Amino acid sequence: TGYDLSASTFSPDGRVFQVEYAMKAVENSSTAIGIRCKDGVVFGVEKLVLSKLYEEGSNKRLFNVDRHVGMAVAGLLADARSLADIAREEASNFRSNFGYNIPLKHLADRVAMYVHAYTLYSAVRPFGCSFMLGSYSVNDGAQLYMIDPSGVSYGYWGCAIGKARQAAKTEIEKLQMKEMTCRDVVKEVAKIIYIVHDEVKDKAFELELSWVGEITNGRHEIVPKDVREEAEKYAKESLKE
Amino acid sequence: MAERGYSFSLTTFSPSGKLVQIEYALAAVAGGAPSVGIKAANGVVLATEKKQKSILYDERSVHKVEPITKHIGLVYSGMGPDYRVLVHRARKLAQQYYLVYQEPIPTAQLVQRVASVMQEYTQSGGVRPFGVSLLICGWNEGRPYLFQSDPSGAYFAWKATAMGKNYVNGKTFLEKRYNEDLELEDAIHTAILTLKESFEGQMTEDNIEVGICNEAGFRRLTPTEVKDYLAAI
Amino acid sequence: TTIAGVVYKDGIVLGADTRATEGMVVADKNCSKIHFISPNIYCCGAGTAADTDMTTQLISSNLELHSLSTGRLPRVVTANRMLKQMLFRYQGYIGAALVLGGVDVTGPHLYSIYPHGSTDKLPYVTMGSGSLAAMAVFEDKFRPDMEEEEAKKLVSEAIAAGIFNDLGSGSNIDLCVISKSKLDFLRPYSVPNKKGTRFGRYRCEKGTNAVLTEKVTTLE
Amino acid sequence: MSRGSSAGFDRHITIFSPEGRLYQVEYAFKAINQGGLTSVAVRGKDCAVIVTQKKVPDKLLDSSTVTHLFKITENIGCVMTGMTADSRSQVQRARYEAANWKYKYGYEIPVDMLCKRIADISQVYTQNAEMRPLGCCMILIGIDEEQGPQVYKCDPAGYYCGFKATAAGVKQTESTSFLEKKVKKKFDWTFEQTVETAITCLSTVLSIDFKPSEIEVGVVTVENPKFRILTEAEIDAHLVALAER
Amino acid sequence: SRRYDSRTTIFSPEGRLYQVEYAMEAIGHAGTCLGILANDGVLLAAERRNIHKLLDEVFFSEKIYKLNEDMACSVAGITSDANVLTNELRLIAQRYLLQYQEPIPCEQLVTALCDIKQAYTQFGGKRPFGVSLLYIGWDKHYGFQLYQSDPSGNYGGWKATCIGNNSAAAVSMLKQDYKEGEMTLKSALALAIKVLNKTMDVSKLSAEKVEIATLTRENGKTVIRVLKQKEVEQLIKKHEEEEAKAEREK
Amino acid sequence: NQYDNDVTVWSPQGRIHQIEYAMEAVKQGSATVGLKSKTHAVLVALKRAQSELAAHQKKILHVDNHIGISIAGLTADARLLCNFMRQECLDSRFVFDRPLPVSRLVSLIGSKTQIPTQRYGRRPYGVGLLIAGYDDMGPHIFQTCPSANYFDCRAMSIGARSQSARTYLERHMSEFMECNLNELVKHGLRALRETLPAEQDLTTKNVSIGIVGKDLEFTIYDDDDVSPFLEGLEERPQ
Amino acid sequence: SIMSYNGGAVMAMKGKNCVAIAADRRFGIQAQMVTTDFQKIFPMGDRLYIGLAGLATDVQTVAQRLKFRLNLYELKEGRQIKPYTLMSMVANLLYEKRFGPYYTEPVIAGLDPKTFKPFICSLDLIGCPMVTDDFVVSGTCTEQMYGMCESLWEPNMDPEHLFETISQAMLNAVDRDAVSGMGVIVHIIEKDKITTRTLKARMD
Amino acid sequence: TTIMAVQFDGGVVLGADSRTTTGSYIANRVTDKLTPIHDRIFCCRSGSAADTQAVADAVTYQLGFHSIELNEPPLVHTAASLFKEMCYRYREDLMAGIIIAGWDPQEGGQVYSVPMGGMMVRQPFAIGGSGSSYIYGYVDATYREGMTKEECLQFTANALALAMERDGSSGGVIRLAAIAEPGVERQVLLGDQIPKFTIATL
Which residues carry this modification: Phosphothreonine (chain H)? Predict the structure, then answer.
């Protein structure tokens, strides 16, 4: 009793329960997925529409960390916004110091260290969000990383974070992403997002899609409206049989 | 991330007037490995046991007997990393004294400064007291010194004393065997016998560490010399 | 002041004069200008004497701490790096110029360090107001891989040239010989100058001085 | 003073119990085993080898990013056991300490000095109550000019030591017993023999036949003091040599 | 952070500071320190609680510390806190001497140390110093003086006082036996010996278990000296002779 | 329990209770309604009086010539946030000589309000704001929360009994867009009146109106400037 | 220029088993005399003395701060300071003000305790010590003092010959200096006694 | 001081004299002004010796840490950027003109000039120091595109020899370094190895 109140306290089993509770908070958020292909990374977010009074695009969970880096988040949105600000500052400082765009692995490591710095003391609270970082460059290719509230950062071929990530992982595993292109990966991501969404539990959602790759010339941006409509139509027709 | 520490004392008085954190640090010391110090007529011998839990350890990598200056040596009982911290601080204090006065620090002054540091950790905020007692030997003004500093920050001058496990039995053994006008070799023999009194298993030239201080200065005893002393015992 | 050093086949020979002047007046005729740094590293000093003394003492203390922590013999590169960083961060306000020489696991090393924080690694260096005469001696007679006695003779000749051709140098010659097996602190090594013998006697006798008051305190 | 006695907040912060222990440090030691992996380090006469098991449960995980072997300098490599983020923070700290040592002293840091510095930092974490100790174990690997190959391991308690062979993780006790048996029967260990000893220790304590992708091997040798990570081809060659005999 | 705070500087429902009272209990568990003021001087008589055949001979004194050329102090309680407080006292005395080029009066030094103690008892969140001090000295304003300070920061002047173990019995003995204005250093030493003998009832009095220091004025100078073993032995012998004479005469 | 007293303590359910308590603090305030057309953004606030002899508390504040806010919750927190926003707008006009975009100001507010929710000894801002602004992107209605989350809204209502107002806004959102200024203000007033009990009616004493638009700076109509907007409002449909 | 503001001259000399320290007594501002009994030699122990020449205010400040530190050292160490240790302490005190220097050049004369070996030394204004074996001089007339001492000093002088030598040197050196003089005070430090004498000097 | 870096197809060629002067006195006639910052990155130092040495040490430290972190060979542009940042942040306190030359897997041979003030420019070739003024016309009239490594070495040696002949602050020996993918090749030209140009008489 009382071993789960501070991030500076270990449990007798050797666990930090505050970090686990932050991860639980992450597990309660909607699902965002990201798939790495041979020429880029595509992000898809199942953005729940909590109220019909909200404007379209409100509470967007896709961010432009840098010109070449995108961010898909899940969990507490204020914590995710603070972490996006941290990543933006890291990328800007790297460009100011070393004179070129930050590699995605280095940026992921820096942001993961910043997140881990909040799992050690009683004076602060662990972040209640997990996020993915995607980027593309000619020299480095397509890269996709995920950071959890504990500060662990790994590179992925296809990643899912949120309420339904095991089913999303099962759907992603059926994809031969190593040979696909962003054009097909966008439709596949839309189909997976429509598959894993719960119509009974959740009233409605918006499909937020973004990508970075050769088709975008190494820039992270929102997937164009035409491709988004085609992907949504394909996902709806695939849900139907 | 927040670099601030706790600003309140973790060691506080009890209704009986006792600082129980200091007593628990003393218990941690009493659970440590035996250490013996004997002040002879022409020097001081510091002895301790270092038996690793496995033969995979490197006996020649970590030393429990450490030099502070050319004329001061250290040995401890309790927690090793705390001893490392105190050794670093003692060396820094001795070097500061030499920088100021351009003469090597007397043993008493270094003991006082280290005890002041230990008291600071016993009273300051957000920290626990050190879990080590130190046996400090030195040679100053053509005279040997032996000191013991406890976790509370109090120090004592000793003719002979023991720390760690079975330190009461070691103290009684020293009372039986110690006498003034003792030569350094006899002091080393008595220290090794005091270690043997509580040593479990077989004592070799690697299971124990011996350091001596005399007019020539302080130095650790090499395993060959320890082997010679053990064969002579 | 004339301080010089060479690298010979098996170590380091350092040399210095022993005269200290305040302006145009000799204040000390036996001044030790070769400073202990570590048992294998020594230093000759020039510039602000107090700055040199304090800098050498601080670096010696730091090197002693470093060697106590590591348990190994100190390296000349460590002393050089410490000295140059400390001098640079003061932007030349610490007017200490040093000839640093020693032998370590990598062999004999000789450095010249300047108050602004620039160092040079050379087989022979000179410093002080008599540095150019000693440098002339070195450029005339130095050869690589000399023996210990030849190196001692060469350094003594350089210091003697500085002593006899510079007004700021004089008195005796001090030599520090460093090798991987021994260290020789020869003070003095040569005495080329001595006071002339008295031709007569001065008047100085008891009762010559008139005294107003006298107080005697007995120390028990 | 009784065994298992508790008083005040000795279970929650790093203060002494009536017996004189620090329970939070032991809990961090258990956090080390919370990772579920095991690593083995063995010292040869001219080489030093670290072997750790590589677990990639899902194919969606890029295997080239799941590494527990890190290089601190050109000549120093490490294997981390325990919590991943704590291990990465400690690796970053070790890299900074080595770089600063080279900048300040003009020569590469010895392995023992780096282990001592890391142990000092972890001790500072063990003495102050405001911060958590790191639930990770670090084993350092390098070549010393005077003494040769060096194997050093530091723990969350602030303790560090040199080893002829050592282990860390869930099965560190069984691995230490196996290495005790191997070392007691002392015989000449070349680079190949040291690598096979580490690999067979891991295999016998895990009781599973190894595939080249299931382990991770890093070595330093006297001939080539640079720390390197073996590729799958070299690990496969070593595994074939082990399996034939 | 709030959960682990002990709140060492807060009031109790009855208006008491618990940490101060606990430090005073610590004082009561310490060794006896005795101070008697005479006409020609003032003395300190402390009980040596650090006794062991394997202990080395003390450098100057175990429990009596010289503060400056004119003052000395004796401490009861935690030893390392006493070391800190004595270092601070010496610093304060030297600072006053630097500022005014005159030796500090005793009461000003006691007031400064008591201000430090009170500052620790009021704010900071730290535990108080568990030391009670006895002060003896001479100054040009009030001559020979004797002061006692508490961990709470309270001090006061005395003609004869005791701190440490069995201090109440010693206080009663001094109340019965001290004669105001008639005390000489010899009679004060005899009273100190008899009080130490009666209070240290568990252990018979010997020169190796007590430390005695006196403060006298010798031709415009202050002399602070510690009595040698033979002198204390002679004092104890005289006390035992007087006790035997009283036993015979009763 | 033991998880509801600190903002740095997660609960076993992955929640922070202090933030929810600050949201309750927002829910305790009087209802206000924000809504926008193609050219105007309107804030209508239902002011409350402590007593019959007390003036109704201010609810709509000036931030800049193009930005105004309506508050619900702790008034001192609201004043702190308003001062921060005013300083940010003044800095923007000083450095770039242009009005600060509303979305960037709302992002700054969220960034500022997130910090106290993660540090020991701090507390969430116990106020929720409805922000009405006009810039190059047109009119904007924004809602901020103590959770440091913010929303871009077509219409929104916060405070006590705001669910009925939100239902009315849901019903008439389809026609909010093409309304003129008077129609939009009447829609907002009807939504605000939906929060009032039957025995209570909208009057010139308890109604405050804030309007910003393309050619209109942010203006607050409080007592006698409200009557033209109140005139024409039909009786409560019950 | 700053050192010549107040004048002054301090000299220390080594005997066979004794040391002598001498100073002039004039206190003045530029060319005006104020007092004729200014103290420049301060006891730092039973057989240890320091003489300070330079700015009078800096003389007093350095003497008082040195007494502060020496009293603390003797209270802590429980012993008397050795003259070499005192020299190191003065050097540290002066070098602490390296960029704000005190305008004093201390002169230290004394016998090593428990050995009674004579010790003399001088320091510059920033704390560079110079331990000699014959004599050390400091003040505004260092050239005259150097000439007198180099002419008159002899090795292994008895205390009487040492007194005569130092007295003649100081008198004839301050007779040739404008801002030094108005009396000379000499301290002879032996193992068993200390003799303080004021010399019959010129007052112009 | 005269320093020179020239780019060829496979890499760069660096050159410098060896004279260090304190007034008109040569304190060090065998100075090494070519400083290796990384395995394939060198720098030429001109100006204040202490400033250039400290900046080179700091850049070596930072670049080593950066390369260890990234597990990637550093870019010559990154070393140039670190030098530029340090030399611009302290342009009032430093007197350092740097030439950074090296080889990159991504960019090949590169020559970057960071003069006093802290600007950074990439050049086909760079010259610095007090002796570089005398050889501006020579390098202008002699440099051509497509020179091989041997031609670049000869060009650098000739220009350095002319500058050392004309400049009093330049002299001693010629230190040359060629950096390419295989590694760094260093050589010293002294005595008759230095190019000779006959003095015009009568």
Answer: 35
